[PDB]
């Protein structure tokens with residue numbers, strides 16, 4: 515309720531840029547010494563996007579444990595996320611090793627492999643059932659099991675096999691294919707429809723390891739997704755929408771990974787998504803069918 519008042523004040527005063535720059539100025543700053551080691555230069559997609567040492571995910575190999583990935587551990591909300599860059603051609607083995615070792619059940623992908631004429635992500639999952647991928651460095655096998663393609667997102671069932679142990683796991687892939695870099699989604703409705711398909715999959719359950727979330731850098735669209743989910747979960751826990759302070763939640767998230775939410779419009783969208791999602795949290799279950807309709811997923 516009180517985020518709604520703040521939304522109006524910021525809008526009718528046109529101060530989203532200043533509000534967002536405030537968050538940037540107050541955000542935590544922690545060292546990234548491991549990410550900056552010369553042996554890890556080719557493991558980083560962007561020179562200026564690095565995991566903090568204190569929250570980085572360590573791979574369980576002894577040669578080089580480095581991956582550009584952060585554990586966002588939201589203590590009060592009791593949910594964790596792994597935010598990571600889009601894998602590089604040499605880090606797709608590391609990416610699936612991380613998924614395996616962290617016992618993630620779901621991967622949320624918010625970018626496309628090619629954006630604005632550039633390769634933003636390696637093709638790290640198989641596109642055809644009969645063309646499985648084997649990651650020889652990490653001894654993992656990945657098979658496409660099935661694929662449900664909708665108008666602006668795709669859900670895939672993957673089988674991930676630890677070839678050392680021959681243990682197998684189902685990994686769910688939630689691929690938002692309609693969300694351009696540095697922008698807000700089309701509508702809260704289509705975003706919330708997607709978020710709630712991730713939730714209903716069980717991939718966010720505490721019984722599993724943290725969901726893996728990535729875009730190209732793992733901060734902008736990835737930060738928007740996590741901020742909206744954590745805010746909705748916080749108000750759900752308290753059944754009190756007015757108790758949620760969005761900027762404080764984002765600032766808390768930015769203790770674990772730098773640059774989360776990259777534009778003022780993405781921040782503004784985050785308010786809109788949470789305000790609209792609160793309708794469902796607070797007991798208007800019919801609104802979820804309305805999101806499905808408005809998102810035109812077929």
Ligand code: VO4
Nearest residue numbers: 730731733734735
């Ligand atoms: O690829 V993202 O720029 O939305 O961090």
Ligand SMILES: [Mg+2]
Nearest residue numbers: 556602603604
């Ligand atoms: Mg590379």
Ligand SMILES: [Mg+2]
Nearest residue numbers: 603604605606
């Ligand atoms: Mg690779």
